[PDB]
Amino acid sequence: RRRQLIRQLLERDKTPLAILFMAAVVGTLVGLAAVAFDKGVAWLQNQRMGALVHTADNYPLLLTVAFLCSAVLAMFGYFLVRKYAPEAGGSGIPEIEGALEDQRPVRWWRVLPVKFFGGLGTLGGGMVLGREGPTVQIGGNIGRMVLDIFRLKGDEARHTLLATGAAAGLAAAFNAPLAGILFIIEEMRPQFRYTLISIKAVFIGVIMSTIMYRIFNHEVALIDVGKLSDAPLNTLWLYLILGIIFGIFGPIFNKWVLGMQDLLHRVHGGNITKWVLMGGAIGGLCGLLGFVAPATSGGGFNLIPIATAGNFSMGMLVFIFVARVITTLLCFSSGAPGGIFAPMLALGTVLGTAFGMVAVELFPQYHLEAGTFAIAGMGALLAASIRAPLTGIILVLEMTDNYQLILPMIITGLGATLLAQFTGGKPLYSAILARTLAKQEAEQL
Amino acid sequence: RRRQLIRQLLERDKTPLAILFMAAVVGTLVGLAAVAFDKGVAWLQNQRMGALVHTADNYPLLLTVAFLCSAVLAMFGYFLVRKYAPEAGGSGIPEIEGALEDQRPVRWWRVLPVKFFGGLGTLGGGMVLGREGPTVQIGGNIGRMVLDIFRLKGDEARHTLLATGAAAGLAAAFNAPLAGILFIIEEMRPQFRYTLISIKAVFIGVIMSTIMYRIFNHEVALIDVGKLSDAPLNTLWLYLILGIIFGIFGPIFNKWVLGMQDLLHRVHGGNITKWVLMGGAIGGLCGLLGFVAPATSGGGFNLIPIATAGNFSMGMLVFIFVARVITTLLCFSSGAPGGIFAPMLALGTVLGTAFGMVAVELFPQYHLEAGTFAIAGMGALLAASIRAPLTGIILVLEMTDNYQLILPMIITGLGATLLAQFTGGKPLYSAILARTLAKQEAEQL
């Protein structure tokens, strides 16, 4: 009746649906955080371009105010990160991957208003860090936040409301919900047996986060090439030797970054009052090299359609490549709050269009294009330095709408990951986690 | 050595690169078969309209040609689906749900080509069935077709190679790679703990199926309505009344389907040649309704973009498009190889726009349109009668590009499935499985 068995006391199914409602509200807050971060970095880029271009009297006044205007923003990044909490640190994901293994415990209160507000300004300063790192660490720690204001279970909820936030941050970064799930289903979840309700909560968070991304931006994804030509079967074996080159380059890049992150510690170990001066001095360098040569610095997403259509010269490509390598080494590994998973796409597609412009002039009998090798090269650094080839292919197919070259890209992935396994090396994100846990073990006496 | 010990004997890639790559190759097929299904039913619709428009001199000539042109294809559907293999009869998902709990073994060499070659002719032939169910069952049977020809061990591969494919049929039939995974998460998987490689294989199958659907069909999403108004924050309490109305309507429709299943079987005491002549009488009525009342027949993917803009007036709406139950009940309960997924997806929207039109003939202080009440009713019958709300939120957000009104969708879901639970009911795609299992139990001893 109305009084007897009134809704069966919420059908005796509170604990199932409560962990889905928590995943829904964290899927609402992540994504809103992502569009706030994107609007803030676009705002800061627009002011740092407009205030620089509003005077055009001579060169050196502009060249000396750009170095100053990016310096205070990068100093606002470093002086927030190294002073308040170093759990911000590097590229996000190495501080959240061990949080699923219950190391580097994610205290949310000292991460959000420092990572968010610092990585707004220093990514808007024009440096070469990515946009995914702050938003994926913010995504996981909002999950820890909106678990720790409701006081849920001790062990299961601490993982299943952190996974659906670490997935949702990456999903709301690039308008790629499947690369948000595929990624977290891979790299950060090892060989075990996972429950049903948890993987449903991850989909709840990812879909309610990409929906809150697509509300405030209703458009096609961030990078565009323009629906290039078909890749026939006769020319497909050039993608395999491109995979050979990328699988060789992967662990060499890992050794490069693991050496540079310790070299920039050897220059200044502690002593934050000189650390933030080095950070501001390198942010001003990235601002100056972003104004004088706009194809060098920046987030990398201002570089894709001007380089996958065959625009620059080959000497310009071999200059931009050795410039962007020394920029994304010397500005990431210093320790600014910023992603490396995003500019690896640019560093991949530059070599992709380089090998395209070589193979077009070297094989005239194939009617090959130099643009459809750049998209195959974009999802190759994610296969040979992250060793997560699924979410290195699916992210590129969600961002770039060039669906026709799926068959080159699965070949250049499965054909670079096996070569990275054959040449030895680790995923970079697990390597940074193990290298940080070595010092975390050495801290105890 | 150098040539010896190649990747430590290929790093033991018997499991993690073959049961993954076979999920990839079963994803790639459903997307060469699903697109053949779609381009076959579109070609049959174009030919059935071109043969219809050829003679337009007077009514009772082409009205009687329309009485038989759908009827011959109805013979070619029913006689195929009943003389050769009586396992395809039904809308897919109840029969493919049986194989996951290990009942009703899927004879892929005998139930697949009959479903294809006699389901396209009766789905594009002028019926009112859906384009989804005989894609889900074809995607399930393609899994066992690929499995029994590559000879895997039948203990876990016989779930993790047809679960991919059972998801990949829907994911490439509705261009929704999220709802395709969440349908098999919510519907066809019990509370048991699941492994990492099986939850990866469904993802790889779904994405390499939706990619090869988006190769041939480069279209915008399949239901293209205009960008409607945003949902106001004070008018959410009307949508809960819509959820209550649909939750009242849901189990009544499920009892209607199961109560006409035996009433349409009562005119079939065996004698398959009488079933084909009853299916001819089904086909003649649904082909007669093809153009003299053209918004009654069809799959319901051409009635939806017209009925949301307030084009249809109230009288013909309540008199015809709600009496559309008398044909979408008559066509699916008979047993033709078509879906009841889509003609509930397009039956909920006319009841939604009826509630929106009475809401705009009522209190005008909100000054809202009835457009926001049809998108919320499109994916609420899926929650109220199939009781899978987590594919009823996302399907009418993947096909309909109106990403704004995610709040009325959540409100009318949690508020229709919640009422449909304690009002008394059971999900149709699990109830008719037990109904056909009762006959499978009563045939022996």
CSV table of C-alpha atoms in Angstrom, one decimal, chain B residues 252-444:
chain,number,residue,atom,x,y,z
B,252,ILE,CA,2.1,-2.0,-19.6
B,253,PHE,CA,4.0,-2.1,-22.9
B,254,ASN,CA,6.0,-5.0,-21.8
B,255,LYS,CA,2.9,-7.0,-20.8
B,256,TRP,CA,1.4,-5.9,-24.1
B,257,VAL,CA,4.3,-7.3,-26.1
B,258,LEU,CA,4.3,-10.6,-24.1
B,259,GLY,CA,0.5,-10.8,-24.3
B,260,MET,CA,0.4,-10.4,-28.1
B,261,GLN,CA,3.3,-12.8,-28.6
B,262,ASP,CA,1.0,-15.7,-27.9
B,263,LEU,CA,-2.0,-14.1,-29.5
B,264,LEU,CA,-0.1,-13.9,-32.8
B,265,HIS,CA,1.1,-17.5,-32.2
B,266,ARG,CA,-2.5,-18.6,-31.7
B,267,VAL,CA,-3.1,-18.3,-35.5
B,268,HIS,CA,0.0,-20.5,-36.0
B,269,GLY,CA,-0.6,-24.1,-35.0
B,270,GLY,CA,2.5,-25.2,-36.9
B,271,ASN,CA,2.3,-25.1,-40.7
B,272,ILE,CA,5.0,-22.7,-41.6
B,273,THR,CA,3.2,-21.9,-44.9
B,274,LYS,CA,0.5,-20.2,-42.7
B,275,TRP,CA,3.2,-18.2,-40.9
B,276,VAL,CA,4.5,-16.9,-44.2
B,277,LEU,CA,0.9,-15.9,-45.2
B,278,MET,CA,0.4,-14.2,-41.9
B,279,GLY,CA,3.7,-12.3,-42.4
B,280,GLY,CA,2.4,-11.4,-45.9
B,281,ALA,CA,-0.6,-9.8,-44.2
B,282,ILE,CA,1.8,-8.0,-41.9
B,283,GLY,CA,3.8,-6.8,-44.8
B,284,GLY,CA,0.8,-5.7,-46.9
B,285,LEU,CA,-0.6,-3.5,-44.1
B,286,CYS,CA,2.8,-2.0,-43.3
B,287,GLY,CA,3.5,-1.4,-46.9
B,288,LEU,CA,0.0,0.1,-47.5
B,289,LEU,CA,0.9,2.5,-44.6
B,290,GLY,CA,4.1,3.4,-46.4
B,291,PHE,CA,2.8,6.4,-48.2
B,292,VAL,CA,-0.9,7.0,-47.7
B,293,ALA,CA,0.0,7.6,-44.0
B,294,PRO,CA,3.7,7.8,-44.4
B,295,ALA,CA,4.5,8.7,-40.8
B,296,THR,CA,3.5,5.4,-39.4
B,297,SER,CA,5.7,2.8,-41.1
B,298,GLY,CA,9.5,2.8,-41.5
B,299,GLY,CA,12.2,2.4,-38.9
B,300,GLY,CA,11.5,5.7,-37.3
B,301,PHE,CA,14.6,7.6,-38.3
B,302,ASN,CA,12.6,10.0,-40.6
B,303,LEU,CA,9.7,10.7,-38.3
B,304,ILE,CA,11.9,12.0,-35.5
B,305,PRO,CA,13.5,15.2,-37.1
B,306,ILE,CA,10.0,16.4,-38.2
B,307,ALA,CA,8.0,15.8,-35.0
B,308,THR,CA,10.4,17.7,-32.7
B,309,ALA,CA,10.1,21.1,-34.3
B,310,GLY,CA,6.4,21.4,-33.5
B,311,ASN,CA,5.5,20.6,-37.1
B,312,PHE,CA,2.8,17.9,-36.3
B,313,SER,CA,-0.4,19.2,-34.9
B,314,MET,CA,-2.1,17.8,-31.8
B,315,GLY,CA,-5.0,15.9,-33.4
B,316,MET,CA,-3.2,13.7,-35.9
B,317,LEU,CA,-0.5,13.2,-33.3
B,318,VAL,CA,-2.7,11.7,-30.6
B,319,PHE,CA,-4.9,10.0,-33.1
B,320,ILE,CA,-2.2,8.3,-35.3
B,321,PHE,CA,1.3,8.5,-33.8
B,322,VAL,CA,0.2,7.1,-30.4
B,323,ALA,CA,-2.0,4.5,-32.2
B,324,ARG,CA,1.4,3.6,-33.8
B,325,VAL,CA,1.5,0.9,-31.1
B,326,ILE,CA,-1.0,-1.1,-33.1
B,327,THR,CA,1.7,-1.6,-35.9
B,328,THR,CA,4.9,-1.6,-33.8
B,329,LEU,CA,3.2,-4.3,-31.7
B,330,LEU,CA,1.9,-6.2,-34.7
B,331,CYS,CA,5.3,-6.3,-36.5
B,332,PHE,CA,7.7,-7.3,-33.7
B,333,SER,CA,5.4,-9.7,-31.9
B,334,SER,CA,5.0,-11.7,-35.1
B,335,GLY,CA,8.7,-12.6,-35.2
B,336,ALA,CA,10.2,-11.0,-38.3
B,337,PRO,CA,14.0,-10.4,-38.0
B,338,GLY,CA,13.9,-6.8,-37.1
B,339,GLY,CA,14.4,-4.6,-34.0
B,340,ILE,CA,12.0,-3.3,-31.4
B,341,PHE,CA,14.9,-1.0,-30.2
B,342,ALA,CA,14.4,1.8,-32.8
B,343,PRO,CA,10.5,1.9,-32.9
B,344,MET,CA,10.4,2.4,-29.2
B,345,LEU,CA,13.1,5.0,-29.5
B,346,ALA,CA,10.8,6.8,-32.0
B,347,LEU,CA,7.6,5.9,-30.1
B,348,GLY,CA,8.7,7.7,-27.0
B,349,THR,CA,9.3,11.0,-28.9
B,350,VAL,CA,5.7,11.5,-30.1
B,351,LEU,CA,4.4,10.9,-26.5
B,352,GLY,CA,7.1,13.3,-25.4
B,353,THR,CA,6.1,16.0,-27.8
B,354,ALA,CA,2.4,15.5,-26.9
B,355,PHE,CA,3.4,16.3,-23.3
B,356,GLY,CA,5.4,19.2,-24.5
B,357,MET,CA,2.5,20.5,-26.6
B,358,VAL,CA,0.1,20.2,-23.6
B,359,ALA,CA,2.8,21.9,-21.5
B,360,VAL,CA,2.9,24.9,-23.9
B,361,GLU,CA,-0.9,25.0,-24.1
B,362,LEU,CA,-0.8,25.1,-20.3
B,363,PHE,CA,1.1,27.8,-18.2
B,364,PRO,CA,3.1,30.1,-20.4
B,365,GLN,CA,5.3,31.8,-17.8
B,366,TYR,CA,8.3,29.6,-18.7
B,367,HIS,CA,7.7,30.5,-22.4
B,368,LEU,CA,9.5,27.3,-23.5
B,369,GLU,CA,9.1,25.3,-26.7
B,370,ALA,CA,8.1,21.7,-27.0
B,371,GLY,CA,11.5,20.8,-28.5
B,372,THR,CA,13.1,20.1,-25.2
B,373,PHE,CA,10.3,17.7,-24.3
B,374,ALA,CA,10.8,15.4,-27.3
B,375,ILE,CA,14.5,14.8,-26.8
B,376,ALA,CA,13.8,13.9,-23.2
B,377,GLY,CA,11.1,11.4,-24.4
B,378,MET,CA,13.2,9.8,-27.1
B,379,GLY,CA,15.5,8.1,-24.6
B,380,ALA,CA,13.1,7.4,-21.7
B,381,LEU,CA,11.1,4.5,-23.1
B,382,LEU,CA,14.4,2.7,-23.2
B,383,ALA,CA,14.6,3.3,-19.5
B,384,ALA,CA,11.0,2.5,-18.8
B,385,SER,CA,10.4,-0.7,-20.7
B,386,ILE,CA,13.9,-2.1,-21.5
B,387,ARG,CA,15.2,-0.8,-18.1
B,388,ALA,CA,18.6,0.0,-19.5
B,389,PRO,CA,18.7,3.7,-18.7
B,390,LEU,CA,22.4,4.0,-19.2
B,391,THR,CA,22.0,3.5,-22.9
B,392,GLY,CA,18.9,5.7,-22.9
B,393,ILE,CA,20.8,8.7,-21.7
B,394,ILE,CA,23.7,8.4,-24.1
B,395,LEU,CA,21.9,7.3,-27.3
B,396,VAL,CA,19.8,10.4,-27.6
B,397,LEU,CA,22.9,12.4,-26.9
B,398,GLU,CA,25.1,10.6,-29.5
B,399,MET,CA,22.5,10.7,-32.3
B,400,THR,CA,20.8,13.9,-31.3
B,401,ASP,CA,23.6,16.5,-31.1
B,402,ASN,CA,21.7,18.7,-28.6
B,403,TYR,CA,24.2,18.3,-25.8
B,404,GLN,CA,22.6,21.1,-23.7
B,405,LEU,CA,19.7,19.3,-22.0
B,406,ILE,CA,21.5,16.6,-20.1
B,407,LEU,CA,19.6,17.6,-16.9
B,408,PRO,CA,16.1,16.6,-18.2
B,409,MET,CA,17.5,13.4,-19.5
B,410,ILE,CA,18.9,12.4,-16.1
B,411,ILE,CA,15.7,13.6,-14.4
B,412,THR,CA,13.4,11.7,-16.7
B,413,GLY,CA,15.5,8.6,-16.5
B,414,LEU,CA,16.0,8.4,-12.7
B,415,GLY,CA,12.3,9.0,-12.3
B,416,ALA,CA,11.0,6.6,-14.9
B,417,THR,CA,13.1,3.5,-14.3
B,418,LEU,CA,12.7,4.2,-10.6
B,419,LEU,CA,8.9,4.2,-10.9
B,420,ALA,CA,9.0,1.2,-13.3
B,421,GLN,CA,10.7,-0.9,-10.7
B,422,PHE,CA,8.2,-0.7,-7.8
B,423,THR,CA,5.1,-0.4,-10.0
B,424,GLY,CA,5.8,-4.1,-11.0
B,425,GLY,CA,7.6,-5.0,-14.1
B,426,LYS,CA,10.5,-6.9,-15.7
B,427,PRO,CA,12.8,-5.9,-18.5
B,428,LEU,CA,11.6,-7.1,-21.9
B,429,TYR,CA,15.0,-8.2,-23.3
B,430,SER,CA,15.4,-10.5,-20.3
B,431,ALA,CA,11.7,-11.5,-19.9
B,432,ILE,CA,11.2,-12.9,-23.4
B,433,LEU,CA,14.5,-14.9,-22.9
B,434,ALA,CA,12.8,-16.8,-20.1
B,435,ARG,CA,9.7,-17.0,-22.2
B,436,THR,CA,11.5,-18.8,-25.0
B,437,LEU,CA,13.5,-20.8,-22.5
B,438,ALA,CA,10.2,-22.2,-21.1
B,439,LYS,CA,9.5,-23.6,-24.5
B,440,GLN,CA,13.1,-24.9,-24.8
B,441,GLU,CA,12.6,-26.7,-21.4
B,442,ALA,CA,9.1,-28.1,-22.4
B,443,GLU,CA,10.2,-29.6,-25.7
B,444,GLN,CA,11.9,-32.6,-24.0
